[PDB]
Amino acid sequence: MWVYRLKGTLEALDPILPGLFDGGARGLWEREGEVWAFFPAPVDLPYEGVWEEVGDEDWLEAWRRDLKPALAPPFVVLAPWHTWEGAEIPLVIEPGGHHETTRLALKALARHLRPGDKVLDLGTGSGVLAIAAEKLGGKALGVDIDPMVLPQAEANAKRNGVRPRFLEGSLEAALPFGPFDLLVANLYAELHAALAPRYREALVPGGRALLTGILKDRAPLVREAMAGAGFRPLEEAAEGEWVLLAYGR
Question: CATH code at 226?
Answer without folding.
Answer: 3.40.50.150
